[PDB]
From Swiss-Prot, chain A:
UniProt keyword Protein biosynthesis, yes or no: no
Gene Ontology biological process: ribosomal small subunit biogenesis; translation
Protein name per UniProt: Small ribosomal subunit protein uS4
Organism: Mycolicibacterium smegmatis (strain ATCC 700084 / mc(2)155) (Mycobacterium smegmatis)
InterPro entries: Ribosomal_uS4, Ribosomal_uS4_bac-type, Ribosomal_uS4_CS, Ribosomal_uS4_N, S4_RNA-bd, S4_RNA-bd_sf
Keyword flag RNA-binding: yes
UniProtKB/Swiss-Prot annotation, chain B:
GO cellular component: small ribosomal subunit
InterPro entries: NA-bd_OB-fold, Ribosomal_uS12, Ribosomal_uS12_bac
Species name: Mycolicibacterium smegmatis (strain ATCC 700084 / mc(2)155) (Mycobacterium smegmatis)
Classification of source organism: Bacteria, Bacillati, Actinomycetota, Actinomycetes, Mycobacteriales
Segments of this protein annotated with the region Disordered: 104-122
Single Gene Ontology MF annotation: tRNA binding
Protein name: Small ribosomal subunit protein uS12
Organism superkingdom: Bacteria
Swiss-Prot record, chain C:
Family of this protein: Belongs to the bacterial ribosomal protein bS16 family.
Single GO biological process annotation from the record: translation
Protein name per UniProt: Small ribosomal subunit protein bS16
Species, as recorded: Mycolicibacterium smegmatis (strain ATCC 700084 / mc(2)155) (Mycobacterium smegmatis)
UniProt keyword Ribosomal protein, yes or no: yes
Record flagged with keyword Ribosomal protein: yes
UniProtKB/Swiss-Prot annotation, chain E:
Gene Ontology cellular component annotations, sorted alphabetically: cytosol; small ribosomal subunit
Molecular functions per Gene Ontology: small ribosomal subunit rRNA binding; structural constituent of ribosome
Protein name listed in UniProt: Small ribosomal subunit protein bS20
Record keywords: Ribonucleoprotein, Ribosomal protein, RNA-binding, rRNA-binding
NCBIfam families (alphabetical): S20
Segments of this protein annotated with the region Disordered: 1-20
Similarity remark: Belongs to the bacterial ribosomal protein bS20 family.
Function summary: Binds directly to 16S ribosomal RNA.
Gene Ontology BP terms: translation
Sequence ranges of Basic residues compositional bias: 5-18
RNA sequence: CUCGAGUGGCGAACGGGUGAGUAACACGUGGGUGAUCUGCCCUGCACUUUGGGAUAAGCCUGGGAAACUGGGUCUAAUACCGAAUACACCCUGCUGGUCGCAUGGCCUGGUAGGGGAAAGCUUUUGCGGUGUGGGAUGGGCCCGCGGCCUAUCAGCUUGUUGGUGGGGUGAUGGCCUACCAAGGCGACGACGGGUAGCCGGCCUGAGAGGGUGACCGGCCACACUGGGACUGAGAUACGGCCCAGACUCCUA
RNA sequence: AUACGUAGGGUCCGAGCGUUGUCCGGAAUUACUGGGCGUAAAGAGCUCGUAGGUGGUUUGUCGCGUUGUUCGUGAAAACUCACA
């Protein structure tokens, strides 16, 4: 369903920006706890586990929903590494986040929790919703007039909208065009390790 | 190796190498425990481990271990025996679940908190 | 004897039906000799798609549609062919036209710019 | 219409017919015939070749030991005799 | 166990009880024809075959014996006459 | 009007259950039955003529603890029993033509002899009856082939095999039966012991392979146990029956 | 005692989370794919030969095995592809 913990501790443990601008994680880059300073018994096991945990904790996705992502990626005709990154870049909250309309992944998580978004005319309170190409996207007025959402929409100096997403008016219409391409995603650390580990 | 001789006979696996013998491959059975006398583990692992012999409902007489520190079971007890593997003891391949039919969970167990029948601390 | 039947399919709240031809002594979901149609009360137009000439044959040899199956036949006008009393005509309604997959985004782009 | 309405011919035949060798032409109106098979093994691939002792009816006693004959199956003509000796082409 | 069909019980008892006498009579007629044929008398055999071809055909038209059993018996008795 | 009880149809053998049994043409995959049946639906033609006996119900009387049960009288019919026309059909005798898979198949062959039915209610959308010709679908039988283990299971076999003639069956067929003959089955594993319903499938495995027959589907077997019989188009007849035991219940 | 037990403190999962029971693979640990038998498991003490398998060079036939082809065929769901 949904996780509980914040992102700073996981950022420190996995040693990567999970908030994106976590002041406290770069304050304490070592893993949390009395022995984040203490050196770890290094293993490629740890490398792959850290990679998958970064992937899970970056987007707000959670483990059981993540495993079926790999499985369906492997079922896809293309190489599993490509398909997994494509589909993880194909989530409803991900689609609305990359448009710069949500300041956090948890922003979009709680937004789809509340029901502040609309795809093709149908309201989907389900973050696990899949948004296809050429989908019509809109934002409801009750959230539109809300003050922090007004800040998010009007101060949208956040990360730029990728070429496969297009906010095309004041209605926050994200007229999606194509799939998230490998040459266009600009993804964090790759996922070939996940494919090789899960395939065994 | 003489393909025709294969047609004559051959190609069987070696041996099942069975593990569980309570009955029915039961995820657990229940029965009456007795002979709860403590015996000795292996010499390098010098200690003493509390065990018992349980006649399960499966009509077989097996040897079960009593995990944890404290025990609640005594003679004529409805103990639930599960399969186990104790290399520390000779011929002991069973345990009794704590926080279950008869044996109360191990007192104040907190590192496991699911095993040893230690319920949630309020 | 022989009867043309409606058999149930789909999940719980939304019913669907296949128009089959079968013996009475079977159950509702036995071996269909031939699937000759399909119908769904759940969908808007109760849309029906029927193999026509096989139904013509089976009516000829003496297939006896079930009461709602016969109702569906009339809803098609098929019973107006084997019996042919007024002649066969399109009697069933249809799903509304509805836009396409591409024209939706075409209109969205036109509205946007 | 006509009082009498006709029927069909139900194209019929092809009763199993095979070449065998008469081997036990011993009992009255009775022969025993054998057949050959050559079948690839399901697992290994060593084509095995086996036989079968069918019992055939000879109303005429034409056959004899070790004759290359042909047989078509009939209706069951007795308890284990279901073959008709036709198209005889070798004796001895 | 008793359920709303003892009427069927009585109906079947009646139906299987009439056929008892019917079959006894027909079998007695057939055995009589047998003594006629074995005795070597052809006129008595011909008349008994005629009467039985009437009787068993009636019984087959009635609900006592399947149509083809009657035809089988008719042919058998007819040949028994034809050769005596 | 309505409808209990009653006669009489029809339905009830399907629809649901279980996997005990079964190692078997049981199932699946492909074919034959020239050796075959089908109430119900569809479709041709022809007929439906006519006479008579009985009963439930209804009512009276009688025995039995009950279970239940007898006698007397009456009851109508699409109920039953006499009989008549059928030739569309069947059986026989002969015989013409024709295709052959040998028995044989086709011409409702012909011929001649013989034989075989039915119904009322109801005005009411009318429903209904008989016989045959055909459809349809449901079937019944036989066979190719596929799929447990175990000689610390190698001989088994006399209605077993073949023929004959019959009885019987829907049809073939030691199916059964009288005679004749002695065959027939196996190391390509009989006959035995144990084991098990089986398949579409499902799951693992890269694949092969391996394990399962949950549920959803396809068939089969079985419905206190064991023997027997019934009917109907159709019966291991689960909520049909009798008989021999078990168990249980009631018991005059 | 970072292995026990206790605390934080960390890992991960989450209305789940671990334990037991069973099957497949990993096992090539039945080796057809895909094993070996001097010393590690494995050549009977040695002969012949029934069954069986098994085959020299060359001529013609048959096309059973074998392959090529057309069609009937393998219910639906199965499972997958594609659409809703």
């Amino acid at each position: 369903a949904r996780y509980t913990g914040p992102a700073t501790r996981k950022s420190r443990r996995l040693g990567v920006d999970l908030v994106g601008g976590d002041q406290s994680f770069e304050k304490r880059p070592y893993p949390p706890g009395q022995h984040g300073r203490a050196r770890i018994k290094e293993s490629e096991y740890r490398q792959q586990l850290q990679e998958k945990q970064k992937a899970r904790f970056s987007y707000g996705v959670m483990e059981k929903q993540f495993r079926r992502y790999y499985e369906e990626a492997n079922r896809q005709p293309g190489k599993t590494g490509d398909n997994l990154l494509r589909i993880l870049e194909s989530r409803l909250d991900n689609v609305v986040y990359r448009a710069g309309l949500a300041r956090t992944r948890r922003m979009a998580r709680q937004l789809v929790s509340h029901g502040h978004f609309l795809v093709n005319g149908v309201k989907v309170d389900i973050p696990s919703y899949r948004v296809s190409q050429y989908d019509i996207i809109d934002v409801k007025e009750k959230s539109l007039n809300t003050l922090p959402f007004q800040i998010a929409r009007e101060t949208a100096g956040e990360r730029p909208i990728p070429s496969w997403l297009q906010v095309v008016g004041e209605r926050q219409r994200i007229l999606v065009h194509q799939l998230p391409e490998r040459a266009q995603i600009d993804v964090p650390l790759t996922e070939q390790l996940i494919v090789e580990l899960y395939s065994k | 190796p003489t393909i025709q001789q294969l047609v004559r006979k051959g190609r069987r696996d070696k041996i099942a190498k069975v593990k569980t013998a309570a009955l029915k491959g039961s995820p657990q059975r229940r029965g009456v425990c007795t002979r709860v006398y403590t015996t000795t583990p292996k010499k390098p692992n010098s200690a003493l481990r509390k065990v018992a012999r349980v006649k399960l409902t499966s009509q077989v007489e097996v040897t079960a271990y009593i995990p944890g520190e404290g025990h609640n079971l005594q003679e004529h007890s409805m103990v639930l025996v599960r399969g186990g593997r104790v290399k520390d003891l000779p011929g002991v391949r069973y345990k009794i679940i704590r926080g279950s039919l008869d044996t109360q969970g191990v007192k104040n167990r907190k590192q496991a908190r699911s095993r040893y029948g230690a319920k949630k601390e309020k | 004897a022989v009867k043309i039947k409606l058999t149930r399919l789909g999940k719980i709240r939304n019913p669907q039906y296949r128009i089959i031809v079968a013996d009475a002594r079977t159950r509702r979901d036995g071996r269909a000799i031939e699937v000759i149609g399909r119908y769904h009360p759940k969908e808007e137009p109760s849309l029906i798609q029927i193999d026509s000439e096989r139904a013509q044959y089976w009516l000829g040899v003496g297939a006896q549609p079930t009461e709602p199956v016969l109702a569906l036949l009339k809803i098609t006008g098929d019973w107006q062919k084997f019996k042919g009393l007024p002649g066969a005509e399109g009697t069933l309604k249809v799903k509304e036209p509805k836009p396409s997959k591409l024209d939706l985004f075409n209109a969205a782009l036109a509205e946007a710019e | 219409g006509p009082k009498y309405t006709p029927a069909a011919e139900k194209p019929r035949g092809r009763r199993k017919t095979a070449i065998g060798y008469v081997v036990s032409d011993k009992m009255q109106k009775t022969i025993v015939v054998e057949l050959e098979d050559r079948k690839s093994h399901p697992l290994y691939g060593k084509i095995i070749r086996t036989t079968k002792k069918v019992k055939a009816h000879d109303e005429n006693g034409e056959a004899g030991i070790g004759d290359r004959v042909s047989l078509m199956e009939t209706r069951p003509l007795s308890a284990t005799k279901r073959w008709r000796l036709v198209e005889i082409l070798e004796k001895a | 166990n008793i359920k709303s069909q003892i009427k069927r019980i009585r109906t079947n008892e009646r139906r299987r009880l009439r056929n008892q006498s019917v079959k006894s009579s027909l079998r007695t007629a057939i055995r009589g024809f047998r003594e006629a044929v074995d005795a070597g008398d052809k006129d008595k055999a011909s008349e008994l075959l005629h009467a039985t071809s009437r009787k068993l055909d009636k019984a087959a038209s009635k609900g006592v014996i399947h149509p083809n059993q009657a035809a089988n018996k008719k042919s058998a008795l007819a040949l028994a006459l034809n050769k005596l």
